[PDB]
Symmetry: C2
Subunit: 129 residues, 2 copies
Amino acid sequence: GNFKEADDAIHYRQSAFSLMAHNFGDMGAMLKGKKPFDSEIFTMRAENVAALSKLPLEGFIQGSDLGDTEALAKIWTDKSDFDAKMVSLQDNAAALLLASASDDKKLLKQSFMKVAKSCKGCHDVYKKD
Amino acid sequence: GNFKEADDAIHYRQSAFSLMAHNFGDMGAMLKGKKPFDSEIFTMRAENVAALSKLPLEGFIQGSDLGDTEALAKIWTDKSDFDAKMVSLQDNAAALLLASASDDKKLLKQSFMKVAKSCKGCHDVYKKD
Ligand code: HEC
Ligand code: HEC
């Protein structure tokens, strides 16, 4: 495989998510009024999350459920469904990036939330309590 | 104000570099003959590197030279030149992604090395030996 050890695959997927959470939260902060809204920065954040959302799936190689991971082994008993959720995260991220082109705020908030729903949705099922 | 703590920016940039190295190295492996060349996979790897290359600069905030980092203190004293090199990496990584559209290996190899020199060039000056 691409990764020399499972720890390399675990580290890879964790970094992809961590970089994605940093960029996603900055959009949330702008939407929730915590910091000023900047369209250019918002679209940059959208670009980042979309590109980042394409990385972590590769990290979920088989046999990487043990060790320092928050991934539940149920990911690989239902890998078909897990991949589907990840593909949806990408589609929802791609939609958010398109919305960031327009300055309709109610369109930005809802397309943002459809992504947030992906984050929470997959975590509830496949990430340790 | 994006990062609550200095440790968060250090982790952010370190993760970006890590994910870029994984994808960039797979391009070298195909170009250098370690693994077979796949045009489609090459372009995906190029896409990842181009997007990943736009992330780490944000991480180099003030006061983040202390702690568990490989960044030298000279980066901030020479921040103008450091930013220019990073923006150059972004430009070169974007150039590599454009090359992957071409089927010319002599261009693919050449554009890959212009990115490779960006990595080595900045490490020699701005990363602890
Ligand atoms: C399933 C298809 C997921 C989607 C969609 C998102 N995430 Fe997730 N995330 C998932 C797993 C299986 C894990 C565990 C990784 C491990 O091996 O530990 C995670 C982890 C995270 C983390 C923690 C990463 C770390 O620092 O160790 C974060 C911060 C995170 N995920 C954020 C995140 C966001 C912001 C998402 C939407 C924008 C998102 N994830 C989607 C599974 C899945
Ligand atoms: C400066 C302008 C850089 C360019 C261009 C590239 N890298 Fe770099 N890299 C740089 C610094 C200052 C650091 C240290 C960051 C820290 O706070 O510790 C790094 C680190 C890396 C790492 C290690 C990441 C980790 O696991 O901690 C890797 C794997 C890495 N850099 C790779 C890399 C590649 C492949 C580059 C070109 C494609 C590249 N870097 C460019 C500074 C700079």
